[PDB]
Design an enzyme around this catalytic site. Structure first.
Site, PDB file in Angstrom:
ATOM      1  N   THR A 145      -4.458   5.955   9.250  1.00  9.34           N
ATOM      2  CA  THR A 145      -5.257   6.192   8.061  1.00  9.34           C
ATOM      3  C   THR A 145      -5.400   4.958   7.182  1.00  9.34           C
ATOM      4  O   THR A 145      -6.014   5.051   6.118  1.00  9.34           O
ATOM      5  CB  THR A 145      -4.668   7.338   7.255  1.00  9.34           C
ATOM      6  OG1 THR A 145      -3.358   6.943   6.813  1.00  9.34           O
ATOM      7  CG2 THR A 145      -4.624   8.629   8.057  1.00  9.34           C
TER       8      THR A 145
ATOM      9  N   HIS B 111       0.788  -1.228   0.000  1.00 10.11           N
ATOM     10  CA  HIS B 111       0.000   0.000   0.000  1.00 10.11           C
ATOM     11  C   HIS B 111       0.816   1.273   0.000  1.00 10.11           C
ATOM     12  O   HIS B 111       0.278   2.306  -0.400  1.00 10.11           O
ATOM     13  CB  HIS B 111      -1.072   0.060   1.098  1.00 10.11           C
ATOM     14  CG  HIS B 111      -0.644  -0.446   2.426  1.00 10.11           C
ATOM     15  ND1 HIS B 111      -0.201   0.381   3.438  1.00 10.11           N
ATOM     16  CD2 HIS B 111      -0.684  -1.695   2.947  1.00 10.11           C
ATOM     17  CE1 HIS B 111       0.060  -0.349   4.510  1.00 10.11           C
ATOM     18  NE2 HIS B 111      -0.221  -1.610   4.235  1.00 10.11           N
TER      19      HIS B 111
ATOM     20  N   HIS C 142       6.679   6.948   5.491  1.00  8.45           N
ATOM     21  CA  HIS C 142       6.151   6.568   4.187  1.00  8.45           C
ATOM     22  C   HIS C 142       5.394   7.763   3.640  1.00  8.45           C
ATOM     23  O   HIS C 142       5.236   8.786   4.308  1.00  8.45           O
ATOM     24  CB  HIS C 142       5.208   5.372   4.294  1.00  8.45           C
ATOM     25  CG  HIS C 142       4.026   5.659   5.156  1.00  8.45           C
ATOM     26  ND1 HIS C 142       4.037   5.437   6.517  1.00  8.45           N
ATOM     27  CD2 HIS C 142       2.843   6.253   4.880  1.00  8.45           C
ATOM     28  CE1 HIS C 142       2.902   5.853   7.038  1.00  8.45           C
ATOM     29  NE2 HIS C 142       2.149   6.341   6.064  1.00  8.45           N
TER      30      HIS C 142
ATOM     31  N   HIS D 246       1.903   9.037   0.994  1.00 13.79           N
ATOM     32  CA  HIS D 246       0.685   8.828   0.223  1.00 13.79           C
ATOM     33  C   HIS D 246       0.731   9.781  -0.959  1.00 13.79           C
ATOM     34  O   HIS D 246       1.184  10.921  -0.805  1.00 13.79           O
ATOM     35  CB  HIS D 246      -0.552   9.141   1.087  1.00 13.79           C
ATOM     36  CG  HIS D 246      -0.602   8.361   2.362  1.00 13.79           C
ATOM     37  ND1 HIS D 246      -1.349   7.210   2.504  1.00 13.79           N
ATOM     38  CD2 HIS D 246       0.062   8.520   3.534  1.00 13.79           C
ATOM     39  CE1 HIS D 246      -1.185   6.730   3.727  1.00 13.79           C
ATOM     40  NE2 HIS D 246      -0.316   7.492   4.365  1.00 13.79           N
TER      41      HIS D 246
ATOM     42  N   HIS E 298       4.441  10.844   6.080  1.00 15.83           N
ATOM     43  CA  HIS E 298       4.104  10.490   7.455  1.00 15.83           C
ATOM     44  C   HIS E 298       5.339   9.914   8.121  1.00 15.83           C
ATOM     45  O   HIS E 298       5.808   8.836   7.724  1.00 15.83           O
ATOM     46  CB  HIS E 298       2.960   9.473   7.496  1.00 15.83           C
ATOM     47  CG  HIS E 298       1.662  10.061   7.080  1.00 15.83           C
ATOM     48  ND1 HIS E 298       0.574   9.298   6.697  1.00 15.83           N
ATOM     49  CD2 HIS E 298       1.276  11.356   7.012  1.00 15.83           C
ATOM     50  CE1 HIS E 298      -0.423  10.108   6.392  1.00 15.83           C
ATOM     51  NE2 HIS E 298      -0.028  11.360   6.571  1.00 15.83           N
TER      52      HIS E 298
ATOM     53  N   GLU F 141      -3.589  13.151   2.234  1.00 16.47           N
ATOM     54  CA  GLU F 141      -4.674  12.640   3.073  1.00 16.47           C
ATOM     55  C   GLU F 141      -5.337  13.794   3.820  1.00 16.47           C
ATOM     56  O   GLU F 141      -6.529  14.071   3.647  1.00 16.47           O
ATOM     57  CB  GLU F 141      -4.112  11.575   4.019  1.00 16.47           C
ATOM     58  CG  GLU F 141      -3.602  10.375   3.269  1.00 16.47           C
ATOM     59  CD  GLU F 141      -3.644   9.097   4.054  1.00 16.47           C
ATOM     60  OE1 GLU F 141      -3.025   9.051   5.127  1.00 16.47           O
ATOM     61  OE2 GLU F 141      -4.280   8.124   3.587  1.00 16.47           O
TER      62      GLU F 141
HETATM   63  O1  LIG Z   1      -1.292   4.971   6.118  1.00 16.64           O
HETATM   64  C1  LIG Z   1      -0.992   5.088   7.215  1.00 16.64           C
HETATM   65  N1  LIG Z   1      -0.872   3.788   7.913  1.00 16.64           N
HETATM   66  C2  LIG Z   1      -0.217   3.806   9.275  1.00 16.64           C
HETATM   67  C3  LIG Z   1      -0.066   2.505   9.744  1.00 16.64           C
HETATM   68  C4  LIG Z   1       0.539   2.351  10.952  1.00 16.64           C
HETATM   69  C5  LIG Z   1       0.959   3.488  11.590  1.00 16.64           C
HETATM   70  F1  LIG Z   1       1.662   3.314  12.743  1.00 16.64           F
HETATM   71  C6  LIG Z   1       0.794   4.780  11.096  1.00 16.64           C
HETATM   72  C7  LIG Z   1       0.129   4.991   9.882  1.00 16.64           C
HETATM   73  S1  LIG Z   1      -0.300   6.488   9.317  1.00 16.64           S
HETATM   74  O2  LIG Z   1      -1.619   6.895   9.861  1.00 16.64           O
HETATM   75  O3  LIG Z   1       0.803   7.435   9.579  1.00 16.64           O
HETATM   76  N2  LIG Z   1      -0.554   6.323   7.766  1.00 16.64           N
HETATM   77 ZN   LIG Z   2       0.376   7.319   6.243  1.00 15.48          ZN
END
Ligand SMILES: O=C1Nc2ccc(F)cc2S(=O)(=O)N1
Ligand SMILES: [Zn+2]
EC number: 4.2.1.1
Length: 257
Positions: free
Chosen positions: A195, A61, A91, A93, A116, A103
């Site tokens: 998210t 993803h 990572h 988006h 992020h 996002e």
């Molecule tokens: O896509 C996201 N997946 C995540 C999955 C695990 C996380 F610890 C943090 C995020 S996140 O909310 O930063 N963004």
């Molecule tokens: Zn993220």
């Protein structure tokens, strides 16, 4: 399994993950006129000088740059946070087009991408325990707009061809995430969630006001990644963003006037 397609995308996630309709879901639109300056918020402390990157992974993803989080080496503190949060991974988006991909939105504006930087609260001992807590994670969110290249991103861009498909990883040592930060640490903050599934309501979001600029060529290379595994039909990894969710009974606070 969940994803970003028509039949498994964000509007479907609530069936497997009912918290998708919860009271503190992310992302959100940041209405800059309604966000209130909070003079009790402290400056953010981003201490990345000893950060130890290890690996870059296509997880199906996004791509995650992972760090050694077995010691206090790269930590986020201050701002709205109590205590110390350790960097575990970052990572992005991004969109299929420069006009979408973030996002969070700002007065409904979508940026081309959003970074992020994920940190977990050391008082819970590890990431898996932290995500079970309302103050378990702090995610530093940084918008990307298309313009001049970001020199500190190019080492990431150049390794992506080696992790094209889901499940591929590559060694990725000595990467300095300080090269991904804008000049100003002015921020908005609110309580929210992951998210992606499991959408746990464990995040203090800290979203920087100042975007970084990346070049069209840099983001174009993000868009050559694949959601699929090797030897499966090619599906470009684009539009891996969840749209804004209802703010409900939350206030977004600004660190700046
Ligand atoms: O896509 C996201 N997946 C995540 C999955 C695990 C996380 F610890 C943090 C995020 S996140 O909310 O930063 N963004
Ligand atoms: Zn993220």
């Amino acid at each position: 399994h969940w994803g970003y397609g028509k039949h498994n995308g964000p509007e479907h996630w609530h069936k497997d993950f009912p918290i998708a309709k919860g009271e503190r879901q992310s992302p959100v639109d940041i209405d800059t006129h309604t966000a209130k300056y909070d003079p009790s918020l402290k400056p953010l402390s981003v201490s990345y000088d000893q950060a130890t990157s290890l690996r870059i992974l296509n997880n199906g993803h996004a791509f995650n740059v992972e760090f050694d989080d077995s010691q206090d080496k790269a930590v986020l503190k201050g701002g709205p946070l109590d205590g110390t949060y350790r960097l575990i991974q970052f990572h992005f988006h991004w969109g299929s087009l420069d006009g979408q991909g973030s996002e969070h939105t700002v007065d409904k504006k979508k940026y081309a991408a959003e970074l992020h930087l994920v940190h977990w609260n050391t008082k819970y001992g590890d990431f898996g325990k932290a995500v079970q807590q309302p103050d378990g994670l702090a995610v530093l969110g940084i918008f990307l707009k298309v313009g001049s290249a970001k020199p500190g991103l190019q080492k990431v861009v150049d390794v992506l061809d080696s992790i094209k498909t889901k499940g591929k990883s590559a060694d990725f040592t000595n990467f300095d995430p300080r090269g991904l930060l804008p000049e100003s640490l002015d921020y908005w903050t609110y309580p929210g969630s992951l998210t992606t599934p499991p959408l746990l309501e464990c995040v203090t979001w800290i979203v920087l006001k100042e975007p970084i600029s990346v070049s069209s060529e840099q983001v174009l290379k993000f868009r050559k990644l694949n959601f699929n595994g090797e030897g499966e039909p090619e599906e470009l990894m684009v539009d891996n963003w969840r749209p804004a969710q209802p703010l409900k009974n939350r206030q977004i606070k600004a660190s700046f006037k």
